[PDB]
Amino acid sequence: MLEEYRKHVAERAAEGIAPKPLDANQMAALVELLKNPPAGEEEFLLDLLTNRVPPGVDEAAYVKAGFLAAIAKGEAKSPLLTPEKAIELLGTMQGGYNIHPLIDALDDAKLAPIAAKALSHTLLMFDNFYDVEEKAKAGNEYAKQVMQSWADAEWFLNRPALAEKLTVTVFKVTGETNTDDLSPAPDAWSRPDIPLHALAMLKNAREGIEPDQPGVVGPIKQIEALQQKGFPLAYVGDVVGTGSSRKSATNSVLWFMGDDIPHVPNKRGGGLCLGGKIAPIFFNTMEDAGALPIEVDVSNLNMGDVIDVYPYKGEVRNHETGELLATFELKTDVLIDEVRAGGRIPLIIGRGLTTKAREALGLPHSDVFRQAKDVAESDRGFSLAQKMVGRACGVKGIRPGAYCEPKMTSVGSQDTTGPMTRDELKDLACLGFSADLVMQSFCHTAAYPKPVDVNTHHTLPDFIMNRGGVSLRPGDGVIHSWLNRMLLPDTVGTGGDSHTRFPIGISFPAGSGLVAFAAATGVMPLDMPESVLVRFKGKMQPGITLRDLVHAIPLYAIKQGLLTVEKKGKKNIFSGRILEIEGLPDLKVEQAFELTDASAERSAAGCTIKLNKEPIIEYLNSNIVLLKWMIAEGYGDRRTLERRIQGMEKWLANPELLEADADAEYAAVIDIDLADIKEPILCAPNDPDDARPLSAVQGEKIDEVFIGSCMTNIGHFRAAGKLLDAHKGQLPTRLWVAPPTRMDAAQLTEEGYYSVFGKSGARIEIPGCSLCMGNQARVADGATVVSTSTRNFPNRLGTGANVFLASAELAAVAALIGKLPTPEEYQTYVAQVDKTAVDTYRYLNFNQLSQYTEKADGVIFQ
Ligand SMILES: O=C([O-])/C=C(\CC(=O)[O-])C(=O)[O-]
Ligand code: F3S
């Protein structure tokens, strides 16, 4: 092990980074070395054992804990460690396989006092808390002091409180920092390897930042130079953390600006982040990771400024002058506790341990922790979302500003956050899921897998199914297209993807840390956000699509003055709030998804849309058959699938839907009149908020077109097909087509549409995210494209590419003529397909497809 291991150390040091943690195989070999240590290797072997092994239920941890338990029990011996030392080290693995040996040690007069100190600061006790109470009740004195210790919150009070004065050096990034900037798509493969992945942070050049190697390595040396001023760094920007939920963005920042975690290799916590505006998902990820995120005016903060931050006072001052630079308020006072605990998650878990111990010993109620603020007189009614969250909490409704913990009915996970989520789950010592349903897809890496992705394909499914989750297969297609067909109406959920925007019920997307917690405990912490109401009125004009309406939201918000495009001092009524939509209650559920999905680009924390029962009834009747069919096909964890089917059947039998009260409170109400939308609306190159009417950008030359995000359904493809079929010959553009699911692909194939795409010269990609994410295939450098995908951030679909977001029907026209069409032209082409609109926009209903029902009829409920 040793020789190969330090060759690795050297390879990595040459590149300036830490070595990867030991794996199970290496840990096993290490065990042998500890039993018979070669001369002169004592200190190395001890460091590897102590600092270079993942904690929790990682496979290497299993091996490490087993070895140590044996040492502590005399069952094994090493000249380098004593039983006392083994117990001490066991107390450093935070949870999982180290707890049993630690509890057993309480029955040993020698080790007990040490085991007790270790358990006293162990948070991940979960059900093991009872094992400890039982020993105390049987007369164990050391068990008693552990209980009292938990009861007194020693684990919390022994941690340094948040200082009153923080002196930090400003690392300032002007404009908007989205998570792609911090953690680029093409580098998604290295996310689980924190130190390596961090090298890509801000690798693309932008104002005031100097990448050590443009397009490959970020401003590591610029960062290092700033660290020499003697103060810790703070990340500072006008708009921070918009876009993708990838925790890797946070991991990277903290790797450079955070603090080490004792005995946990290659992962950092803490830190400070300041932005004019901070996207809600990013904010959560930062607080869960132990950082302190603060929304404040940053115009007076400059690259390299040394600064004094006073959390309790809410002031930022120049360090040399004492001048006031800005003032602020923490979003909640509980943040102070979160930082002290090392993050919101550890806080919740630890606080619950103390509470549990306080009730066992018959004590009052802790006064050590800050409580969430109280909400005033509960006179008025509730909005749809407030009722949904309320019901998930056993109450009629939850008010904005309140802290709550909704039950998680559905949890989604995809393959680019999956590996991180899996790691976070290991850190939380999770061996089984408590959420009602956890589904894992393989949509982001299936088309052009790297070797590491292949390992992901062969390993993540089991990790998920063994915990009771449902797993799809590479080639099945996009997460949301499947996940949405597994949802229960009016319920609450989350997912490791920013586009987890349930078209029925409500979801609050999150980073891998919180997704792990929600999967494991079946619950999610939530500071209830405010809502913004968007109301559609009237009838759609000719040739207008649902997608145009999605884009009209930012458009009208800009007209009314609730949204601005300029990044400095950006205004955005939607940021951090729940977007609630009404006015289109008869939309098919997948149509509803187009609107709810796009709430992500609004920077909304979540979304609801009011729908009638019929379209949901149709959807569920179709989904029941799909799920039975999945069982017949052999899919991941049958029991979970079966229970979900029953849940759907129960609802169909008594179809009830929640509804907003007429007197609900909203932060703002936006009315949009469909009669005023006469021409298609696009999102102009590189900003999802920059909505413009077709007439404003008509004539722009187009190189490449992309059709097929989770924003599309089979109807969009039929539409594009009919348009292409009408104008035979090869296209002047490069057209990419990517059906969201294999069910979609198969039906289009059966209907003859692949011949149509084939003759046109189009590329048909396998079911999955394809170009939408930009992590595998990419558009040509500097190309101008029109895309039905969700995000046109700089460098996403391609390097230096300019991307217009539009509807599928408009995109098909553009692909045909090589440029954005004029409103008149657009209407001429589409008029043609409207004649057969009934045939074109037929949705997939699995209960009407024999190949599906036949397999469903063959299933016996276990
Ligand atoms: O990178 C990821 O796997 C997270 C995503 C995908 C993306 O950025 O489209 C998200 O939260 O949306
Ligand atoms: S990345 Fe995939 S999940 Fe949807 S938003 Fe794009 S197709």
mmCIF file of C-alpha atoms in Angstrom, residues 60-351:
data_model
loop_
_atom_site.group_PDB
_atom_site.id
_atom_site.type_symbol
_atom_site.label_atom_id
_atom_site.label_comp_id
_atom_site.label_asym_id
_atom_site.label_seq_id
_atom_site.Cartn_x
_atom_site.Cartn_y
_atom_site.Cartn_z
ATOM 1 C CA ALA A 60 -13.142 2.485 4.950
ATOM 2 C CA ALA A 61 -14.715 3.643 8.203
ATOM 3 C CA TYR A 62 -16.248 0.187 8.647
ATOM 4 C CA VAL A 63 -12.803 -1.369 8.467
ATOM 5 C CA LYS A 64 -11.241 1.257 10.725
ATOM 6 C CA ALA A 65 -13.919 1.001 13.414
ATOM 7 C CA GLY A 66 -13.757 -2.808 13.426
ATOM 8 C CA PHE A 67 -10.011 -2.725 13.948
ATOM 9 C CA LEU A 68 -10.188 -0.200 16.765
ATOM 10 C CA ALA A 69 -13.017 -1.998 18.581
ATOM 11 C CA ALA A 70 -10.856 -5.117 18.589
ATOM 12 C CA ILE A 71 -7.933 -3.148 20.037
ATOM 13 C CA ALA A 72 -10.102 -1.708 22.791
ATOM 14 C CA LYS A 73 -11.382 -5.175 23.644
ATOM 15 C CA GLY A 74 -7.939 -6.797 23.742
ATOM 16 C CA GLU A 75 -9.076 -8.922 20.801
ATOM 17 C CA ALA A 76 -6.183 -7.341 18.891
ATOM 18 C CA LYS A 77 -2.868 -5.642 19.589
ATOM 19 C CA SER A 78 -0.646 -2.929 18.155
ATOM 20 C CA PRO A 79 2.582 -1.498 19.545
ATOM 21 C CA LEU A 80 1.407 1.909 18.264
ATOM 22 C CA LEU A 81 -1.907 2.198 20.067
ATOM 23 C CA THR A 82 -3.362 1.386 23.453
ATOM 24 C CA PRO A 83 -6.996 0.442 24.132
ATOM 25 C CA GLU A 84 -7.399 3.921 25.650
ATOM 26 C CA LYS A 85 -6.178 5.470 22.401
ATOM 27 C CA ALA A 86 -8.494 3.264 20.344
ATOM 28 C CA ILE A 87 -11.518 4.513 22.266
ATOM 29 C CA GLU A 88 -10.372 8.088 21.797
ATOM 30 C CA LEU A 89 -10.043 7.619 18.030
ATOM 31 C CA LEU A 90 -13.387 5.829 17.886
ATOM 32 C CA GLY A 91 -14.865 9.002 19.352
ATOM 33 C CA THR A 92 -13.644 10.887 16.303
ATOM 34 C CA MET A 93 -15.685 9.018 13.658
ATOM 35 C CA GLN A 94 -18.887 10.983 14.492
ATOM 36 C CA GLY A 95 -21.349 8.147 13.948
ATOM 37 C CA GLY A 96 -22.161 4.850 12.354
ATOM 38 C CA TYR A 97 -19.890 1.925 13.095
ATOM 39 C CA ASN A 98 -18.114 3.578 16.024
ATOM 40 C CA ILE A 99 -21.095 3.861 18.367
ATOM 41 C CA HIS A 100 -21.660 0.238 19.511
ATOM 42 C CA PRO A 101 -18.018 -0.265 20.562
ATOM 43 C CA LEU A 102 -18.236 3.062 22.352
ATOM 44 C CA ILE A 103 -21.338 2.032 24.287
ATOM 45 C CA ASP A 104 -19.972 -1.399 25.217
ATOM 46 C CA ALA A 105 -16.935 0.370 26.647
ATOM 47 C CA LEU A 106 -19.142 1.940 29.307
ATOM 48 C CA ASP A 107 -19.183 -1.435 31.031
ATOM 49 C CA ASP A 108 -15.405 -1.297 31.430
ATOM 50 C CA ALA A 109 -14.062 0.627 34.442
ATOM 51 C CA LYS A 110 -10.828 1.458 32.616
ATOM 52 C CA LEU A 111 -12.196 2.662 29.270
ATOM 53 C CA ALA A 112 -15.596 3.949 30.459
ATOM 54 C CA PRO A 113 -14.496 7.485 31.471
ATOM 55 C CA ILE A 114 -13.032 7.956 27.989
ATOM 56 C CA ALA A 115 -15.919 6.420 26.089
ATOM 57 C CA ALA A 116 -18.213 8.676 28.088
ATOM 58 C CA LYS A 117 -16.354 11.825 27.043
ATOM 59 C CA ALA A 118 -16.468 10.667 23.423
ATOM 60 C CA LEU A 119 -20.188 9.859 23.477
ATOM 61 C CA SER A 120 -20.791 13.163 25.202
ATOM 62 C CA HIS A 121 -19.782 14.942 21.999
ATOM 63 C CA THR A 122 -21.254 12.423 19.576
ATOM 64 C CA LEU A 123 -24.270 13.861 17.763
ATOM 65 C CA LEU A 124 -25.319 11.074 15.394
ATOM 66 C CA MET A 125 -26.767 8.866 18.130
ATOM 67 C CA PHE A 126 -30.246 8.469 16.656
ATOM 68 C CA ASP A 127 -31.887 5.319 18.037
ATOM 69 C CA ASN A 128 -28.686 4.467 19.892
ATOM 70 C CA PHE A 129 -29.663 7.073 22.477
ATOM 71 C CA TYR A 130 -31.937 4.486 24.063
ATOM 72 C CA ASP A 131 -29.129 1.992 24.464
ATOM 73 C CA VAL A 132 -27.403 4.629 26.574
ATOM 74 C CA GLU A 133 -30.467 5.473 28.653
ATOM 75 C CA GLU A 134 -30.907 1.787 29.485
ATOM 76 C CA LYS A 135 -27.387 1.461 30.898
ATOM 77 C CA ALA A 136 -27.945 4.571 32.990
ATOM 78 C CA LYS A 137 -31.173 3.118 34.342
ATOM 79 C CA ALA A 138 -29.346 -0.096 35.241
ATOM 80 C CA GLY A 139 -26.978 1.889 37.458
ATOM 81 C CA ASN A 140 -24.162 2.868 35.078
ATOM 82 C CA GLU A 141 -22.573 6.047 36.419
ATOM 83 C CA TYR A 142 -20.681 6.882 33.235
ATOM 84 C CA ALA A 143 -23.887 6.485 31.239
ATOM 85 C CA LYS A 144 -25.464 8.933 33.665
ATOM 86 C CA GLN A 145 -22.845 11.583 33.037
ATOM 87 C CA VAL A 146 -23.301 11.197 29.285
ATOM 88 C CA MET A 147 -27.035 11.805 29.696
ATOM 89 C CA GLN A 148 -26.503 14.846 31.890
ATOM 90 C CA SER A 149 -23.853 16.073 29.450
ATOM 91 C CA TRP A 150 -26.332 15.866 26.572
ATOM 92 C CA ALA A 151 -28.931 17.453 28.827
ATOM 93 C CA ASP A 152 -26.581 20.364 29.510
ATOM 94 C CA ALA A 153 -25.691 20.709 25.822
ATOM 95 C CA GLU A 154 -21.955 20.400 26.454
ATOM 96 C CA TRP A 155 -21.467 19.372 22.803
ATOM 97 C CA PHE A 156 -22.715 22.850 21.933
ATOM 98 C CA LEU A 157 -21.296 25.040 24.719
ATOM 99 C CA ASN A 158 -17.777 23.610 24.341
ATOM 100 C CA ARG A 159 -17.719 25.087 20.850
ATOM 101 C CA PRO A 160 -16.406 28.621 20.352
ATOM 102 C CA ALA A 161 -19.299 31.066 20.059
ATOM 103 C CA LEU A 162 -19.477 33.309 17.019
ATOM 104 C CA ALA A 163 -17.114 36.211 17.696
ATOM 105 C CA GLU A 164 -18.469 39.756 17.942
ATOM 106 C CA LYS A 165 -15.835 41.119 15.590
ATOM 107 C CA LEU A 166 -14.788 39.290 12.424
ATOM 108 C CA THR A 167 -11.849 40.684 10.517
ATOM 109 C CA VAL A 168 -11.798 39.377 7.005
ATOM 110 C CA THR A 169 -10.178 40.149 3.664
ATOM 111 C CA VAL A 170 -12.605 40.788 0.803
ATOM 112 C CA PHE A 171 -12.354 38.521 -2.236
ATOM 113 C CA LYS A 172 -14.727 40.412 -4.500
ATOM 114 C CA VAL A 173 -16.374 39.176 -7.668
ATOM 115 C CA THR A 174 -18.395 41.848 -9.461
ATOM 116 C CA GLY A 175 -21.630 40.988 -11.154
ATOM 117 C CA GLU A 176 -23.431 37.687 -10.767
ATOM 118 C CA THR A 177 -21.695 34.534 -9.647
ATOM 119 C CA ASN A 178 -23.831 31.550 -10.639
ATOM 120 C CA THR A 179 -22.950 28.046 -9.468
ATOM 121 C CA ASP A 180 -21.685 27.146 -12.957
ATOM 122 C CA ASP A 181 -19.028 29.835 -12.550
ATOM 123 C CA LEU A 182 -17.897 28.332 -9.257
ATOM 124 C CA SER A 183 -18.247 24.688 -10.345
ATOM 125 C CA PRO A 184 -18.160 24.295 -14.158
ATOM 126 C CA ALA A 185 -20.201 21.565 -15.884
ATOM 127 C CA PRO A 186 -17.342 19.851 -17.752
ATOM 128 C CA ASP A 187 -15.758 19.346 -14.327
ATOM 129 C CA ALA A 188 -18.768 17.598 -12.795
ATOM 130 C CA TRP A 189 -16.873 14.331 -12.896
ATOM 131 C CA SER A 190 -14.466 15.416 -10.130
ATOM 132 C CA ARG A 191 -16.987 16.834 -7.625
ATOM 133 C CA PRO A 192 -16.572 14.124 -4.939
ATOM 134 C CA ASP A 193 -12.830 14.859 -4.940
ATOM 135 C CA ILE A 194 -13.095 18.272 -3.281
ATOM 136 C CA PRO A 195 -9.483 19.549 -3.497
ATOM 137 C CA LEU A 196 -9.148 18.528 -7.167
ATOM 138 C CA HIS A 197 -12.566 19.894 -8.172
ATOM 139 C CA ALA A 198 -11.826 23.204 -6.417
ATOM 140 C CA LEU A 199 -9.068 23.917 -8.962
ATOM 141 C CA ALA A 200 -11.769 24.593 -11.541
ATOM 142 C CA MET A 201 -13.451 27.273 -9.463
ATOM 143 C CA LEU A 202 -13.776 30.419 -11.598
ATOM 144 C CA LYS A 203 -11.517 28.949 -14.271
ATOM 145 C CA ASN A 204 -13.237 31.146 -16.857
ATOM 146 C CA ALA A 205 -11.971 34.728 -17.058
ATOM 147 C CA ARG A 206 -14.157 37.598 -15.954
ATOM 148 C CA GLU A 207 -13.645 41.146 -14.701
ATOM 149 C CA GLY A 208 -11.048 41.445 -11.952
ATOM 150 C CA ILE A 209 -10.277 37.770 -11.633
ATOM 151 C CA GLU A 210 -7.074 36.118 -12.848
ATOM 152 C CA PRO A 211 -7.359 32.385 -13.614
ATOM 153 C CA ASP A 212 -3.965 30.693 -13.228
ATOM 154 C CA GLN A 213 -4.761 28.877 -16.483
ATOM 155 C CA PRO A 214 -7.801 30.231 -18.348
ATOM 156 C CA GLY A 215 -10.362 27.513 -19.025
ATOM 157 C CA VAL A 216 -8.628 24.999 -16.745
ATOM 158 C CA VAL A 217 -7.432 26.439 -13.414
ATOM 159 C CA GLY A 218 -8.901 29.292 -11.357
ATOM 160 C CA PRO A 219 -7.247 32.193 -9.527
ATOM 161 C CA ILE A 220 -5.634 29.957 -6.934
ATOM 162 C CA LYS A 221 -2.529 32.113 -6.780
ATOM 163 C CA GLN A 222 -4.582 35.308 -6.608
ATOM 164 C CA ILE A 223 -6.471 33.761 -3.688
ATOM 165 C CA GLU A 224 -3.275 32.568 -1.980
ATOM 166 C CA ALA A 225 -1.696 36.007 -2.281
ATOM 167 C CA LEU A 226 -4.694 37.535 -0.516
ATOM 168 C CA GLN A 227 -4.379 34.971 2.257
ATOM 169 C CA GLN A 228 -0.956 36.423 3.067
ATOM 170 C CA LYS A 229 -2.523 39.602 4.452
ATOM 171 C CA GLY A 230 -3.044 37.476 7.543
ATOM 172 C CA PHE A 231 -6.843 37.385 7.563
ATOM 173 C CA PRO A 232 -9.349 34.734 6.476
ATOM 174 C CA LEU A 233 -11.145 35.434 3.193
ATOM 175 C CA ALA A 234 -14.802 36.220 2.587
ATOM 176 C CA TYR A 235 -16.548 35.650 -0.729
ATOM 177 C CA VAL A 236 -18.263 38.828 -1.929
ATOM 178 C CA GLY A 237 -20.477 39.563 -4.921
ATOM 179 C CA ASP A 238 -23.487 41.557 -6.129
ATOM 180 C CA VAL A 239 -25.565 38.493 -6.918
ATOM 181 C CA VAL A 240 -24.377 35.193 -5.532
ATOM 182 C CA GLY A 241 -25.289 31.560 -5.978
ATOM 183 C CA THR A 242 -27.961 31.611 -8.641
ATOM 184 C CA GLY A 243 -28.652 28.625 -10.853
ATOM 185 C CA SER A 244 -27.769 24.985 -10.219
ATOM 186 C CA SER A 245 -27.959 23.490 -6.724
ATOM 187 C CA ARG A 246 -24.595 21.673 -6.997
ATOM 188 C CA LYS A 247 -23.055 21.681 -3.534
ATOM 189 C CA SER A 248 -19.688 21.478 -5.279
ATOM 190 C CA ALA A 249 -19.863 25.245 -5.737
ATOM 191 C CA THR A 250 -20.019 25.612 -1.971
ATOM 192 C CA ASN A 251 -17.477 22.851 -1.287
ATOM 193 C CA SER A 252 -14.988 24.731 -3.440
ATOM 194 C CA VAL A 253 -15.444 28.173 -1.877
ATOM 195 C CA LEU A 254 -15.137 26.691 1.591
ATOM 196 C CA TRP A 255 -12.122 24.620 0.572
ATOM 197 C CA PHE A 256 -10.337 27.925 0.003
ATOM 198 C CA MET A 257 -12.029 30.093 2.648
ATOM 199 C CA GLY A 258 -13.185 27.656 5.304
ATOM 200 C CA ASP A 259 -11.719 25.792 8.257
ATOM 201 C CA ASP A 260 -10.584 22.170 8.493
ATOM 202 C CA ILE A 261 -12.796 19.676 10.295
ATOM 203 C CA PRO A 262 -10.848 17.679 12.876
ATOM 204 C CA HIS A 263 -10.144 14.136 11.660
ATOM 205 C CA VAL A 264 -12.269 14.499 8.538
ATOM 206 C CA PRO A 265 -10.062 14.609 5.433
ATOM 207 C CA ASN A 266 -10.583 16.842 2.392
ATOM 208 C CA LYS A 267 -13.672 18.665 3.558
ATOM 209 C CA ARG A 268 -13.858 22.132 5.031
ATOM 210 C CA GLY A 269 -16.579 24.055 6.883
ATOM 211 C CA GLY A 270 -17.257 27.546 8.193
ATOM 212 C CA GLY A 271 -16.575 30.673 6.177
ATOM 213 C CA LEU A 272 -18.385 33.906 5.424
ATOM 214 C CA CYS A 273 -20.256 34.951 2.301
ATOM 215 C CA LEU A 274 -21.677 38.361 1.410
ATOM 216 C CA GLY A 275 -23.872 39.262 -1.522
ATOM 217 C CA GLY A 276 -26.204 42.040 -2.580
ATOM 218 C CA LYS A 277 -28.598 39.183 -3.199
ATOM 219 C CA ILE A 278 -28.075 35.501 -2.355
ATOM 220 C CA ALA A 279 -30.135 32.839 -4.155
ATOM 221 C CA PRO A 280 -32.243 30.807 -1.704
ATOM 222 C CA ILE A 281 -30.828 27.347 -2.482
ATOM 223 C CA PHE A 282 -27.263 28.618 -2.226
ATOM 224 C CA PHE A 283 -28.077 30.370 1.017
ATOM 225 C CA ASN A 284 -29.345 27.085 2.499
ATOM 226 C CA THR A 285 -26.367 25.073 1.342
ATOM 227 C CA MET A 286 -24.004 27.590 2.874
ATOM 228 C CA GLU A 287 -25.787 27.597 6.258
ATOM 229 C CA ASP A 288 -26.024 23.801 6.313
ATOM 230 C CA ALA A 289 -22.286 23.677 5.744
ATOM 231 C CA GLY A 290 -21.540 26.007 8.657
ATOM 232 C CA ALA A 291 -20.850 29.204 6.730
ATOM 233 C CA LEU A 292 -22.429 32.578 7.471
ATOM 234 C CA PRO A 293 -24.305 34.030 4.496
ATOM 235 C CA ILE A 294 -25.367 37.662 4.708
ATOM 236 C CA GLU A 295 -27.325 39.806 2.269
ATOM 237 C CA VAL A 296 -25.896 43.329 2.324
ATOM 238 C CA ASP A 297 -25.006 46.204 0.049
ATOM 239 C CA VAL A 298 -21.567 45.363 -1.333
ATOM 240 C CA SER A 299 -20.890 48.376 -3.549
ATOM 241 C CA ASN A 300 -18.445 49.786 -0.979
ATOM 242 C CA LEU A 301 -16.486 46.544 -0.666
ATOM 243 C CA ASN A 302 -13.499 46.140 -2.976
ATOM 244 C CA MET A 303 -11.151 43.342 -3.963
ATOM 245 C CA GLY A 304 -8.602 43.192 -1.169
ATOM 246 C CA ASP A 305 -10.323 45.505 1.295
ATOM 247 C CA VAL A 306 -9.782 44.410 4.882
ATOM 248 C CA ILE A 307 -13.049 44.563 6.756
ATOM 249 C CA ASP A 308 -14.665 44.201 10.168
ATOM 250 C CA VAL A 309 -17.959 42.328 10.322
ATOM 251 C CA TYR A 310 -20.082 42.582 13.475
ATOM 252 C CA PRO A 311 -22.750 39.889 13.377
ATOM 253 C CA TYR A 312 -24.604 40.833 16.554
ATOM 254 C CA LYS A 313 -24.615 44.557 15.695
ATOM 255 C CA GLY A 314 -25.309 44.175 11.974
ATOM 256 C CA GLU A 315 -22.532 46.473 10.783
ATOM 257 C CA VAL A 316 -19.630 46.303 8.328
ATOM 258 C CA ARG A 317 -16.722 48.716 8.841
ATOM 259 C CA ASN A 318 -13.363 49.467 7.292
ATOM 260 C CA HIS A 319 -10.670 47.917 9.494
ATOM 261 C CA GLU A 320 -8.171 50.775 9.221
ATOM 262 C CA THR A 321 -10.613 53.670 9.400
ATOM 263 C CA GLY A 322 -13.537 52.355 11.444
ATOM 264 C CA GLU A 323 -15.780 53.922 8.825
ATOM 265 C CA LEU A 324 -19.267 52.463 8.457
ATOM 266 C CA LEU A 325 -19.498 50.700 5.086
ATOM 267 C CA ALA A 326 -22.897 49.056 5.424
ATOM 268 C CA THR A 327 -25.536 47.716 7.787
ATOM 269 C CA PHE A 328 -27.520 44.470 7.729
ATOM 270 C CA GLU A 329 -29.744 41.965 9.496
ATOM 271 C CA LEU A 330 -29.259 38.210 9.654
ATOM 272 C CA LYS A 331 -32.266 36.437 8.101
ATOM 273 C CA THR A 332 -32.898 34.748 11.471
ATOM 274 C CA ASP A 333 -31.235 34.873 14.881
ATOM 275 C CA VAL A 334 -30.948 31.077 14.808
ATOM 276 C CA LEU A 335 -28.114 31.509 12.258
ATOM 277 C CA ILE A 336 -25.848 32.360 15.181
ATOM 278 C CA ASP A 337 -26.494 28.918 16.670
ATOM 279 C CA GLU A 338 -26.099 27.296 13.265
ATOM 280 C CA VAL A 339 -22.584 28.640 12.826
ATOM 281 C CA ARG A 340 -21.584 27.617 16.359
ATOM 282 C CA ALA A 341 -22.813 24.053 15.845
ATOM 283 C CA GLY A 342 -20.795 23.793 12.630
ATOM 284 C CA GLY A 343 -23.897 24.087 10.497
ATOM 285 C CA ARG A 344 -27.680 24.046 10.613
ATOM 286 C CA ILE A 345 -27.885 20.270 10.138
ATOM 287 C CA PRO A 346 -25.619 19.370 13.102
ATOM 288 C CA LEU A 347 -27.546 22.001 15.058
ATOM 289 C CA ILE A 348 -30.924 20.363 14.399
ATOM 290 C CA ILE A 349 -29.586 16.889 15.212
ATOM 291 C CA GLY A 350 -27.688 17.911 18.347
ATOM 292 C CA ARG A 351 -30.472 20.130 19.653
#
